[PDB]
Design a protein around this ligand. Structure first.
Ligand SMILES: [K+]
Lengths: 90, 99
């Protein structure tokens, strides 16, 4: 019956595990880019290399914006679902 | 040299992050669809059910599960913001370093 609730609680477990894995990759990403800033600081054309660093950082900036937008989209939908639920029961 | 090999490595890492995320975005879709069907099944239950105690027990169970997803999503959002803003700090610093 309404024991999709046991099942879906288990889906959250799986997705939470998948999340820490992705968070790990976010720390490692942040790790390399800090190492790389330090390299550039030491070496301060090389401004073609600078141009490429800026363009790569731009990519990461755009990707994390997409990550945010996506979390907010699903979070918003969860809210709507809780609102629907509330009106259902009240 | 050390500078070049990091630039390739970090680019491979971004591509690996793009793929991992698409998988996570897929999972968020799934969760959203699963919870939609959870809601539909609840509606079916509420319809048939005539026992107020069992209804109230199930309402509680539903609220608590939704709260867990709510809390976890707020946690995904906080982590992305933390790392996004760290990057933006680095980007600003770097801009001023090279100009
Ligand atoms: K009823």
């Amino acid at each position: 019956l309404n024991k999709l609730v046991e099942h879906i609680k288990e889906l959250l477990q799986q997705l939470n595990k998948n999340w820490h894995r992705h968070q790990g990759n976010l720390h490692d990403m942040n790790q390399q880019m800090e190492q790389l800033f330090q390299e550039f600081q030491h070496f301060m054309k090389l401004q073609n290399m600078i141009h490429e660093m800026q363009q790569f950082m731009n990519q990461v900036d755009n990707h994390l914006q997409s990550e945010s937008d996506t979390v907010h989209h699903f979070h918003n939908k969860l809210q709507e679902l809780m609102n629907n639920f509330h009106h259902l029961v009240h």
